Amino acid sequence: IVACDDPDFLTSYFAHSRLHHLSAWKANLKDKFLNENIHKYTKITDKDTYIIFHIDFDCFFATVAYLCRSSSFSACDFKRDPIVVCHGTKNSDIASCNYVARSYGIKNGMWVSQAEKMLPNGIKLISLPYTFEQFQLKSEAFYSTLKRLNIFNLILPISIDEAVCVRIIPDNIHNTNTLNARLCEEIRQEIFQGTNGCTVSIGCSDSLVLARLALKMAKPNGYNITFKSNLSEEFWSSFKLDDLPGVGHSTLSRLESTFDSPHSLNDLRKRYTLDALKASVGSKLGMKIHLALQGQDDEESLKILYDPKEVLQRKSLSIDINWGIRFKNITQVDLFIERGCQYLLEKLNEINKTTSQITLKLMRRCKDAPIEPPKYMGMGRCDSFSRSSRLGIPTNEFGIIATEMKSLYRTLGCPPMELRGLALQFNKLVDVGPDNNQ
DNA sequence: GGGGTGTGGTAGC
DNA sequence: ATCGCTACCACACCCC
Ligand SMILES: Nc1ccn([C@H]2C[C@H](O)[C@@H](COP(=O)(O)OP(=O)(O)OP(=O)(O)O)O2)c(=O)n1
Ligand SMILES: [Mn+2]
Ligand SMILES: [Mn+2]
Ligand SMILES: [Mn+2]
Ligand SMILES: [Mn+2]
Secondary structure, three states: OOOOOOOOHHHHHHHOHHHHHHHHHHHHHHHHHHHOOOOOOOOOOOOOOEEEEEEOOHHHHHHHHOOOHHHHOOOOOOOOOOOEEEOOOOOOOOEEEEEEHHHOOOOOOOEEEHHHOOOOOOOEEEEEEEOOOHHHHHHHHHHHHHHHHOOOEEEEEOOOOEEEEEEEEOOOOOOOOHHHHHHHHHHHHHHHHHOOOEEEEEEEEEOOOHHHHHHHHOOOOOOEOOOOHHHHHHHHHHHOOOOOOOOHHHHHHHHHHOOOOOOOOHHHHOOOOOHHHHHHHHHHHHHHHHOOOOOOHHHHHHHHHHHHHHHHOOOOOEEEEEEOOOOOOOHHHHHHHHHHHHHHHHHHHHHOOEEEEEEEEEEEEEEOOOOOOOOOOOOOOOEEEEEEEEEEEEEOOOHHHHHHHHHHHHHHHOOHHEEEEEEEEEEEEEEEEOOOOO
C-alpha cells in the first residue's frame, strides 16, 4: 500500500491504472507509426479511391483476461457466464465485460455493485483481474498480423485494440462486396489464429464514419460492409444517437431536448434541420453530425488519411492523477508536483523536445461534498481549476518548470486538504535542433 | 484579420 | 477497498 505522499505513488498508481495503460499504449503506437514511416510516404491523396476497414477486438480485456486466466478461474465459461475485468468488488470500474454480461444490460465503465444489481438470482458475476502484459502481447500479435497480410496501404493505430486500415482501389480493379467479404473473413481468421483465440469485428465502408457504425453493427464476432450506396432506413434505425461519432452524454442530452427525444439515428435523421442542429450542439459539431448522417466524413476527420504523420505527431504532454489524492499540507503537495514534473521531463527528453508553456489543473472538493466519497480514494464531487504560464525561452530545465508549476498551484489557492486531483501539462513542444548557439 | 485565456466535451474510452 | 488517463478540438470572450 502506497499513499500519495510516498515517493513510489506515481509508479504504483500508473502500474495499476488501466486508463493510464490505455493512454500510454496509444501514445507508444503513435510514436511507432511516425518512426516506422520516417521515409515511407503513407498518405492518401485526392487521386485515391479507398476502402476503410475499421477493426476492433470484441470485449478486449475480458477476452484476453479470460484466455490467460489463473487456475482459480479454470472452470469459468466465456460463452455462458457474465464476466467482467476489474480491481475491486464494490465501487470498482468494470473495464470490460463480455457479451453474456451485456445481455443483462451491463456496460464498460459501470461499477461492479451497479452491475451485480442487474443479474437475476442464480446468476453470479465472474470478476477477473487485469493482465496488462498479456493485453499488450495480444495487441502486438494484432498489429503484426495486419501488416503481414500485405493488403493495406495504410494502417492507423486507434488504440491498443483497434485500428483503421485503408485499402486503395486502382481504377482498373473492380471492387465487389464478395471481395470485401473475403478480406473481412481472412482478417478475422488470421487475427483469431495469431492471437490464440481473440476475436475481432470489422466495419467496412467508403467513409470513416460509416466504417465505425458498420463496426458497431458487426459486433460481436462479425463483420458488416455498408457503403454509402448501400445506405437505408433499416441501417439508420439500428443505431442510438450515442453511436454517432462526436456525440457523448452532453451532446446526447442536447439533441434529445431539441428534437423531441429521438430514439435512433433514423429518428434524428428525419427530424433535424442543419440550422437547429448547429443551434443545439454547436456550429462545427452540428456540421459534423449533419455530414455523419449522410454517411460522410468531415474535413477534420479526413486529416488523418491525408496527413497522418502531422495528425499523429504529439503536440502536448501531460499526466493526470485524480485518484488517491489526500494531502495534509503544502510541503507534500509541492513534493508531489516535483515528482510529477520529473516524470514528465523524462518523457520530454525521451522525445528530444523542449516546452515553452505549461499548465496545472486541479480538482477541489465541492464545499458540501463528503471528505471521503463513495468510491474509495475517489476524487468525489469537485470543481476544476486550471492556470497556465508561458515560459520565457523553450526549456527542459527541471528548476524552471517545477518552480513555475508550484507557482501555478499557489496561484490557484486550493488548500492541500481540499485537493482531490492534479493534472500537469507541457502545452507547446519545440524540437531540439543540432544548432543551439544562442 | 491576428493573437491570447480558461472551460468543456469527447476521441481513444 | 481501489488504482476516475491523456490528447486534441471547439468555444466564449479578451487583447491589439
Ligand atoms: N469505460 C471503459 C471502456 C473500455 N476500456 C478498456 C477495456 C476495453 O476492453 C478496451 C477496449 O475498449 P473498447 O471500446 O474497444 O471495448 P471492448 O473491446 O471491451 O468491447 P467491444 O469493443 O466489443 O464493444 O479498453 C476501459 O478500461 N474502460
Ligand atoms: Mn473492442
Ligand atoms: Mn476499441
Ligand atoms: Mn457516443
Ligand atoms: Mn470503444
